[PDB]
Amino acid sequence: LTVNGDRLWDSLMDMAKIGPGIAGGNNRRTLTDEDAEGRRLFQRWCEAAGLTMGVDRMGTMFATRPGEDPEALPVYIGSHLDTQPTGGKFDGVLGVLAGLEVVRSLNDLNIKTKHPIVVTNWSNEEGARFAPAMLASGVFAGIHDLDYAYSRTDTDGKTYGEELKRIGWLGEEEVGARRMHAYFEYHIEQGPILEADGKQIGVVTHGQGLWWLEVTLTGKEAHTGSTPMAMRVNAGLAAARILEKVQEVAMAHQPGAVAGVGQMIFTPNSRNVLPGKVVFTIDLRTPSQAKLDSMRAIFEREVPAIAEELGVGCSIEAIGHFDPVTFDAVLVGRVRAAAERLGYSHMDIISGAGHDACWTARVAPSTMIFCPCVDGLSHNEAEEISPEWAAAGCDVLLHAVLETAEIVQ
Amino acid sequence: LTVNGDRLWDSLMDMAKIGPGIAGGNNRRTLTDEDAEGRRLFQRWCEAAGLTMGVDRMGTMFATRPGEDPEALPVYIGSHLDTQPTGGKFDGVLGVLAGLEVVRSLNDLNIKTKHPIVVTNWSNEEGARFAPAMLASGVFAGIHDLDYAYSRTDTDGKTYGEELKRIGWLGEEEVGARRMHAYFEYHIEQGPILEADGKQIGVVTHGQGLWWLEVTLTGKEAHTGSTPMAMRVNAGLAAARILEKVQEVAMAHQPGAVAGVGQMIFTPNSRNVLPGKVVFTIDLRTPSQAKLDSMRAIFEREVPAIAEELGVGCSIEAIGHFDPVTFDAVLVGRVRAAAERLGYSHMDIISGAGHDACWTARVAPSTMIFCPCVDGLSHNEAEEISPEWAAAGCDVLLHAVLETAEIVQ
Ligand SMILES: [Zn+2]
Ligand SMILES: [Zn+2]
Ligand SMILES: [Zn+2]
Ligand SMILES: [Zn+2]
């Protein structure tokens, strides 16, 4: 049994035509008109494949294929259609549309299952327009209330909840109200491991835990000409030395830990004035609870000490956190076995990023499947997979789901 | 014997009322309409003091007080009325309005001079809106042609030359056509030295030379979750290590050198994506030619080696440069002597920043006078001096000018 990879591929290219970016990728941020366009197209496809559409109060979309057991809970296949402003075509979209290809493959064969199958598009997974990321799955898994989620505002000062109403995807359903037999998410690695190790299938075992530590450094705004070295209070240098320490800390915890900085903000950011304020986020991740606690403790001690070294003030706010996630070992094994059975090359991998699956794992037996991506490139328009990679993992998805939903024939 | 410090102070407070900033300072950037308003008020004052106004093709304003010798070249008293967006009330303004106070004090006493005195408001000294700084004095001293200066455009894409015409300060006079007997500029220190050493008067002997080395680092945009440490090409860490090098190089060149970074720009600047591009300016300065060449050479060699260490691409563009300026020893001497005779405390100081004086020094015997400023604060709305500080240095200015222009009696 396999999926129609050509049909999968075509769907990916059709969805990529909505909210196209500036370089062959996508800018289809959550709750834009472009996102509404993608939602509608997906719904059209879902209906054409015999699925009934449910929508929750966060706008998550649940497309149900009936099971033959009316008491059986559904096997959910989820991801997200929303993208980064420099979005790739495959991040998120692959998982959603793989779920759709699974259905279509089951419809082609008239397969009946005991469990219903529900293909799921989570609202605002990316957290690019409204933070946090994984916002709708967050409410679903009880991580935060609807109120909190609704009040998230974008860089235009519009709220999530207003925008959700504006495009008319404020659904009827209570968020978190569905119980899942199981949850699968198929996604690109967003990293270079599978490609570099030549593996078609990443058997996701865990998701790495993280802290986002937002560091605000307070310097003295001082002309870089007229201020002698000995009288500088240099928040940019402090930031710099902290970035070194972050690298040193990450390296002391190898293997299987990361830390680094993506976002750095100097104020005023003039060429001839030392910053009054420097803000940055230390992103530290590991599947190892001990390493995550250890890096976080180290940062809490050393970051202000490095600031203090330069007379720079320092406050640290935890703006993101979850502990390492263990995917359901039975579902993991199904994915591993299916990859073996299908003759695909495969390895076990840690999910480096968070996904909606990391939240569903709290309320439901959850796992993920990875396919490779070229050069580990993600969150960028040049993000690439082959149709062969797309289909390989969708095949593993088909098998793992069908084993879980249970074929009636 | 002295200036009216009350009248000086009042003029400062009147000028600070035009294009007021957010917080006690000024946003009266060059060739804004509020710049035009400041120009107009200064002209009104100038005319009421018996000065005739000339304007060059850059909009520099030259207010002449007659001399008794019709062949004598003028003693120029210059600064600028344009401010940083978060400008202080005193930067530039003090010099121009001190020139006006000198005139008024000479008029109060009906003093005649051999040399005419010209009060000068240079256009776009700050270089906030249209870069570089010292644009009008630059053209005056032949550093750059009118073409280049006119073609400077702001962040809105309006050109300097359009804007100059818009406000109707495109003057008749050929830029650089005036020959100066002498040039004085009275300016705040913009640094903490005079304040820290309890001196009222900075006798400026030299202006430090500079290089501005804009470094563009090319990294790999890579998710900070999904990318293993060993596969990162981290342009932000490269930037960090370069900032540390910059500090270590600065500290090796003490005494009498600076280097540091005010401007840092990460792209895309997301929390979960390592930058594809980091741009920053290494601002390095010293009155020592040897140390300036040394620092420059060391950066040109070591910055790419730091980048190469991390696999980061590196490109260095010199975006600004002038050599150390020696102010005219005779005019320096007069400033020092006038401070001594008047009983003000005083020290020799190096101009940390560039000023219009540093360009006039090419075509004319030039010097500067500094007064203190609170905490070295400049290019910020909380930039502060006392009326006492303002007046002490304007007194030294009156004496130095009158000795140079020569009293008739
Ligand atoms: Zn995703
Ligand atoms: Zn993503
Ligand atoms: Zn100035
Ligand atoms: Zn200034």
Numbering used by the authors:
A (entry chain A), B (entry chain B): 7 to 415
Question: Any passages from the paper?
Answer:
N‐carbamoyl‐β‐alanine amidohydrolase (CβAA) constitutes one of the most important groups of industrially relevant enzymes used in the production of optically pure amino acids and derivatives. In this study, a CβAA‐encoding gene from Rhizobium radiobacter strain MDC 8606 was cloned and overexpressed in Escherichia coli. The purified recombinant enzyme (RrCβAA) showed a specific activity of 14 U·mg−1 using N‐carbamoyl‐β‐alanine as a substrate with an optimum activity at 55 °C and pH 8.0.
In this work, we report also the first prokaryotic CβAA structure at a resolution of 2.0 Å. A discontinuous catalytic domain and a dimerisation domain attached through a flexible hinge region at the domain interface have been revealed. We identify key ligand binding residues, including a conserved glutamic acid (Glu131), histidine (H385) and arginine (Arg291). Our results allowed us to explain the preference of the enzyme for linear carbamoyl substrates, as large and branched carbamoyl substrates cannot fit in the active site of the enzyme. The structural analysis provides new insights on enzyme–substrate interaction, which shed light on engineering of CβAAs for high catalytic activity and broad substrate specificity.
